[PDB]
Amino acid sequence: PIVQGQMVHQAISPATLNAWVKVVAEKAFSPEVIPMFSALSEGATPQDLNTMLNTVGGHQAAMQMLKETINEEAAEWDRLHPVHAGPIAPGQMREPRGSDIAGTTSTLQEQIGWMTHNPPIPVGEIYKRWIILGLNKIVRMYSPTSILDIRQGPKEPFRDYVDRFYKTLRAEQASQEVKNWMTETLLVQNANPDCKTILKALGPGATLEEMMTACQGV
Amino acid sequence: PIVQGQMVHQAISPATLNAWVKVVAEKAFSPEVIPMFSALSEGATPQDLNTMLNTVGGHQAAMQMLKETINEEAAEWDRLHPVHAGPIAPGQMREPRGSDIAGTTSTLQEQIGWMTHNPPIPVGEIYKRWIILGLNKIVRMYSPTSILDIRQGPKEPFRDYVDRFYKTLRAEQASQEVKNWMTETLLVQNANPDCKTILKALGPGATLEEMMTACQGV
Amino acid sequence: PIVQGQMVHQAISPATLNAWVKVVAEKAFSPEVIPMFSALSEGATPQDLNTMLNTVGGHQAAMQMLKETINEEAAEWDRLHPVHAGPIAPGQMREPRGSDIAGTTSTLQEQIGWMTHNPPIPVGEIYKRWIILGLNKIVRMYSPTSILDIRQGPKEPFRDYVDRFYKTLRAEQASQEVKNWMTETLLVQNANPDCKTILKALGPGATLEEMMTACQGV
Amino acid sequence: PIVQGQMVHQAISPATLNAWVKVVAEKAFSPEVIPMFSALSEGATPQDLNTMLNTVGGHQAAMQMLKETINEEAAEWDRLHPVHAGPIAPGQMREPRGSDIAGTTSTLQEQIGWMTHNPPIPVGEIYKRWIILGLNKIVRMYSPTSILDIRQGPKEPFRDYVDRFYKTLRAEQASQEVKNWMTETLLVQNANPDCKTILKALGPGATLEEMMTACQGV
Amino acid sequence: PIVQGQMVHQAISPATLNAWVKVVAEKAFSPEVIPMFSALSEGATPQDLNTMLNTVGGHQAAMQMLKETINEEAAEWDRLHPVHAGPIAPGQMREPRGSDIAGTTSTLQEQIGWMTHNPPIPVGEIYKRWIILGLNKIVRMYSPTSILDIRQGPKEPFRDYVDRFYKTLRAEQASQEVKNWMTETLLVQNANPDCKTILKALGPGATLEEMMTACQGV
Amino acid sequence: PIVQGQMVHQAISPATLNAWVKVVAEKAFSPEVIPMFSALSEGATPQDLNTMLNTVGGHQAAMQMLKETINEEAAEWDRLHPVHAGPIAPGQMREPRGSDIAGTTSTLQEQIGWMTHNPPIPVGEIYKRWIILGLNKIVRMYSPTSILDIRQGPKEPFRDYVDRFYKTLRAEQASQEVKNWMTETLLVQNANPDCKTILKALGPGATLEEMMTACQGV
Ligand SMILES: [Cl-]
Ligand SMILES: [Cl-]
Ligand SMILES: [Cl-]
Ligand SMILES: [Cl-]
Ligand SMILES: [Cl-]
Ligand SMILES: [Cl-]
Ligand SMILES: [Cl-]
Ligand SMILES: [Cl-]
Ligand SMILES: [Cl-]
Ligand SMILES: [Cl-]
Ligand SMILES: [Cl-]
Ligand SMILES: [Cl-]
Ligand SMILES: [Cl-]
Ligand SMILES: [Cl-]
Ligand SMILES: [Cl-]
Ligand SMILES: [Cl-]
Ligand SMILES: [Cl-]
Ligand SMILES: [Cl-]
Ligand SMILES: [Cl-]
Ligand SMILES: [Cl-]
Ligand SMILES: [Cl-]
Ligand SMILES: [Cl-]
Ligand SMILES: [Cl-]
Ligand SMILES: [Cl-]
Ligand SMILES: [Cl-]
Ligand SMILES: [Cl-]
Ligand SMILES: [Cl-]
Ligand SMILES: [Cl-]
Ligand SMILES: [Cl-]
Ligand SMILES: [Cl-]
Ligand SMILES: [Cl-]
Ligand SMILES: [Cl-]
Ligand SMILES: [Cl-]
Ligand SMILES: [Cl-]
Ligand SMILES: [Cl-]
Ligand SMILES: [Cl-]
Ligand SMILES: [Cl-]
Ligand SMILES: [Cl-]
Ligand SMILES: [Cl-]
Ligand SMILES: [Cl-]
Ligand SMILES: [Cl-]
Ligand SMILES: [Cl-]
C-alpha cells in the first residue's frame, strides 16, 4: 500500500496476507468478505490487489469469473479513454490502459507514479472498484437462499426470522429502493400468523425496533 | 484512523479488524462490547467506522436497527444544519450533510479534510456518537433480565448477587439518578432475609464496600 | 497513551486491550493484576484508563466499588482545590475538577492539554493513583486467606509454606513495618516443629535465604 | 528488504520468516505458494531471498532443482553481460555477475549499492524473477492432475467441476492463448451429458458466469 | 525502556510483558530464564524492571529473597556513595541513593534524567545488575541436582550424559576456573567404564568434540 | 540489532526471541536452523548474539562445543591481530581482542562504537561467522545418516529417494566440488535397478529435472 503529507510505498504486511487468506478460507463468499477485503486493501496498488487475489487457493471458478469481470471493466475503460500517440514528455507519464490499471501491463513504479501525481490518477481505487464489482457478482451467485422463501416458523422467535431475512437481503444486493419495497412488504407478509396480526396492528410506517418490540414476548 | 503535531491518515489495522470481529463473534451485544468498539475506533474516519460495522456477519437485525438509528440522527443533523447554496470558495470545503457524516455520500479525502480543518469539523466523533447511541439501544433491547427480577437466593453469597444486580443494571442504561434510586432501594429490598436484616442495621447511607463487608461470612 | 522530546497522543492498542481483558478474565483480582494494569496503562490519559475499566465484563460488584472509591478521591481533590471564577485567559486552560481527572467531564483534548502543559498537570497519573487505590481495596477484600492461618504442614516442604505465606502477605497489603513484624514473628512461629527448632537455632536476625537453606533437606 | 523518498535497508522480519516457513510446510508447491512468496519478498535483497529459500527444510529435491534453474539463469546473464577489465572508478561500483545477483558472491553492502544507485540495477527483482521461474517449473512438475483428465461426474455439481478444472489449469501454466483454447474446448467437451447439452445450447462465445448460471439447478 | 542519537523513553510493550509472564510460568528458575529476563529488559528503567518483577504471581519466596538481595546491594551502594547536603543547583540533579536505583524512592522523570545525563548515571543497568545477582542466587538454590552426582549410565549414550552434566554445571554457577577443573576431572571420572577407557586413551588436553566423537558408536 | 542513513541501536525483539527459542525447541540442529539463526540475527551486536545463544535451554553439550569453537576462533584472531600498547587517542577507540568480538570483555557501547565507525569494524558479522562455523560443526556431528547409505527402495518413488539424498547431503557440508562428485556418482549408483537403467540411458550430463522426469511414472 501507499501511506509531512508525502505519500510513500509500503510492502503488503504478513498480518494482512494471513488475515486475507484466513477470511477466504473461513467464510468463502459471505457478504462480509467484501468489506473485509476492502478493509485489508486500503491504499493498495494494483500489485497489492493482484497479490491478494492470487494468494487465494481453490475457488478457482469464482476467481475466473472475477478475471472475466475485470477484463470487461478494462475494455470499457479503454473504450472511454482512447490512447494518444506521441512521445511522453519529460515531466509526464503515459496515461494508463485498462490492463495498466489491472496491474498486468504496468510496473510498480508506474503505479506509484500515477497514484502520487498532481493531480492523482487513482488506479488503485479504480481497480478495487472493478474487483468489488466482480466480488458482488460472485456473492450474489453463490447465495443459497432467495428473499421470497424466508418465512417465519410457527414457533420461531421474531428476532431469528429477522436475522435470516436481512442476511438473505444483504446477499440479494438489489437497489436501495427495491430493498425498501422488500422490507415494506415481505417482512410482515411472511411473518407467522400471530406476529403478523400484531405487526398489521402496528401500522404502515413501522420501524424495525417497534416491530421487534411488538413481537418480543410473542 | 487519523493519528510535530500534524494529523495524518492511517489504514485500519488487521489487528483492529480481527479484534472487532472476534469480540462481536464472542460477546454479541453485552454492554462491554460498546467501550471495546469505542476503543478500537479511536480517531476513526466515517469510512473506518463503516468498515467495522460492515465486517459484522450475522446479527443483521441489530445491524439494520443500527442503520435506522443512524438515519434518524442524520435527518436531525440536516434539520439543524440547513445547507447553503453557492460555489465553494477556494480555500474552503462544503459543509457536511447527515449522509456525509455517515460516510455514504462523502469521500475519504473530504472526511480527512473536515477532520484536519482549522477549526475542525469532527465528523468521526459525531458519527461514532450516533453509532454508540444505536448500540446502546440494541444492548438495552437484547438484555435477557430486568433489574426488578434480581433477587438474592437463600444460600447465594452476597457477592454473586451484587454481581448479577450490577450486570443487569449496566444493561438497563437508565439515567444516573434513576440508577441511584435502584441501588438505593432494590439492592437491599431484594436481598435474602438474613443479609437484608444486616443491611437494614447498617443504615441508609451505606457504601457498597460496607454492605459487602457486613454480609461476607453471612 | 501519550508518548525531539515532544509528547504526542496515541490510541490504545489492540494488543493492550486484549492483554488487559485476558488478564482480568484469567486472574480476577490476584495481586499481580495491579502492576499488570499499571504496566498496560503507562502514560495513559483518563480516557484510556476509563477505556480499560469499562471493557471489563462481569465483576460488576468490584467495578462498582472502584467507582465509589474514585468518587471519594474526586471529592477530596475538589475539597483541596477550590475552583476560581472568571474567564479563562488566552494562553491558559481551566484547572481540572475531580470529575475532569476521572475523565467523565473533560474532553480528550483537555486531558492532552493538561498533560503536555508547562508545567504539567498529570491528570493521568493522578487518576491511575486513585484507580490503583480502589484496586488495592478490592484485592484486599477478595483475598481468601488470612496471614494468621498460614501454618506449615507436618510434611510440607519449607519452600511451599514460604510461598503460601508470602502470597497471603502480599494480599494483606499492610504497612511495611507491620509486614516486617509478620515476617519477624509468624513465619517461624507457624512453622512445623522440626523446621521451627532449626529456625530457632538460626537466630533472631535471619534472612530468608538462610532460613530456607536450613530447612532444605528437612 | 529495502523500503523523504530515500531507500533504506531492513532486516527480514520474524513474521515474514514464520509466514514463509508456515506456508511451505502447509501447502508444499500448490500454485498459490508462488504469489505468497512474491508477497513476502517485496523489495528483498538477494540475501533476503536466499534467506527464505534456505530456511526451507525438506523438499530438498525441489530446492536442488531450483538451484539448477538459478544457475542456468546466472550463466545466461553472464553470457549477455560480458565483464569489463579495469579498476572501478571512485564514485562507481562494479557491474554484477550472475552469482552476484544470486547473492553468493556479493556482500549485502554491494547489493544495497546496486539497488539504490542512480540509475538502479535491480538485482533483487532479477533474482526473484529467476526464482519464480524455477518455482513455476517445480509447481508444474509436482501437479498430480492433467487438464485432459478433468471430467464432470454424472451427479457432480457444475461448480465443483469448474473448480477442479481451473485449479488443474492454473497448475498447467501454459501460455495464455493455449489456456484460451483449453477453456474454449475442454470445459464443455468434458462436461456431463445434460450440462453439456445446455452449454451447447448457450453458444460459442459464452462467459463463465453464463455457463455456471445455465447449469445451476441442473 | 529508553531507546539522530537522542535517547527517548518508551512504555513497556504488551509483547514484552506476555513473554516475561509466560517464561516465568513455564520454566520457573531454570538458568535460561536469566538471559531471557536480560533480553526483555534491554534499556529498561528501574520502573520497567520493578514492573517485570511485580507481574510475577506465585514464587513469592523467591521474589522475597530477591527483595532481600536488592536491599543488600542498595545498602552497599549507599555505604560507598555518601550523600552530600545542599541545594541541588539549577542545571543539575541529585545523586541517587540505593532506593532511588531500585526505583522505590525515585520518579520516572528522575530515572530518565539520570539515564540521559552527560555523563550518564546508568541506574537501569546497575539495578539490573543487582536483580541478576539475586536471580543467580535463586537459580543456584532451586537446582535439583549436584555436579558430583552426575554419573553416566551403563547404557546411556555419551551425548545424553554430557547434556545432563553441562546442564547441572550451568546451574552450579561456580567460578570459571572451578568449572575448568570440574570439566577437567569429573566428566571423564564419572563416565561409564567403556567410554571412560576410551577417554583415558584420548589424552589430558581433549576437547569436547573429540571426546564426543570417540564415544559416538560406543 | 543496529538498523538519513545513520546506524542506530535497537533492543532484540520479543518476536525474535520467541522465534529463536521456538525453532531450537522444535528442530534441534537440523541444517535449516542455521539460516534461520542468521535470519534472526541480522545486524546483531555480539550482545544480541550471546543473548540468543544463552536463551537456549538444554542441548548444553552442543552449546559447550560452540563455546570451544568460539574460543579457538578468538585465539586465532588474537594471533593475527597483535595488540598495541599506548593510550587510546581522543577521537579513537581501542582495537578489539578476540573476547571483545565474542562480547564477553566489551560493553554494548564499545560494540556500537566499532560497528558504526568510519571505517567500520564489523564485530557482529565476525562473531556471527564464528558462531555459524560452530553450528555447522554441530549439525554435521548430530546428523543421523551418511550419504553412502542412502539407497532407493525397490518400490520407493524417485522423488522421495532424491529428497532423502539431498537432505543427508545438506547435512554433510562437504566442499562444493565433493558434493558435485557425490551427485555425479552416488545418486544414480544408488538408485533401484529400473530407475538406474533409465538414468544410465539418460547420459552423463543429466540435470535433476531430467532425471526426476525420466523416473516419474516408473
Ligand atoms: Cl481457499
Ligand atoms: Cl462457497
Ligand atoms: Cl498467480
Ligand atoms: Cl482519471
Ligand atoms: Cl476515475
Ligand atoms: Cl434461511
Ligand atoms: Cl424475540
Ligand atoms: Cl457475528
Ligand atoms: Cl444476542
Ligand atoms: Cl457492506
Ligand atoms: Cl460542528
Ligand atoms: Cl458538533
Ligand atoms: Cl441473573
Ligand atoms: Cl460473600
Ligand atoms: Cl471478566
Ligand atoms: Cl474473584
Ligand atoms: Cl461503559
Ligand atoms: Cl497539580
Ligand atoms: Cl498532583
Ligand atoms: Cl494457603
Ligand atoms: Cl524445601
Ligand atoms: Cl518443509
Ligand atoms: Cl509436494
Ligand atoms: Cl543453507
Ligand atoms: Cl540492468
Ligand atoms: Cl534488467
Ligand atoms: Cl481433480
Ligand atoms: Cl451448481
Ligand atoms: Cl508464576
Ligand atoms: Cl521452581
Ligand atoms: Cl506489586
Ligand atoms: Cl556512577
Ligand atoms: Cl556505576
Ligand atoms: Cl540429571
Ligand atoms: Cl552418542
Ligand atoms: Cl531447547
Ligand atoms: Cl539433536
Ligand atoms: Cl547465561
Ligand atoms: Cl577489521
Ligand atoms: Cl574482518
Ligand atoms: Cl534417510
Ligand atoms: Cl515419482
Author numbering:
A (entry chain A), B (entry chain A), C (entry chain A), D (entry chain A), E (entry chain A), F (entry chain A): 1 to 3, 7 to 221
Article sentences:
HIV-1 capsid protein (CA) plays critical roles in both early and late stages of the viral replication cycle. CA consists of 231 amino acids that fold into two distinct domains, the N-terminal domain (CANTD) and the C-terminal domain (CACTD), connected by a short linker. The core is composed of ∼200 hexamers and precisely 12 pentamers.
CA residues R18, E28, and K30 are highly conserved among known HIV-1 isolates. They are at opposite ends of the N-terminal domain interface (or NDI) pocket formed by the ends of two symmetry-related helices (R18 and E28 in H1 and K30′ in H1′) from neighboring CAs within a pentameric or hexameric unit. R18 is at the “top” of the pocket, whereas E28 and K30′ are at the “floor”. In the available models of the HIV-1 cores, E28 and K30′ interact through an H-bond and form the floor of the NDI pocket in 87% of the intrapentamer and 24% of the intrahexamer interfaces. In contrast, interactions at the top of the pocket (R18) appear to be more important at intrahexameric interfaces, consistent with the loss of hexamer-containing tubes observed in our TEM studies with R18A. On the basis of the data, it is likely that both parts of the NDI pocket contribute to stabilization during assembly.
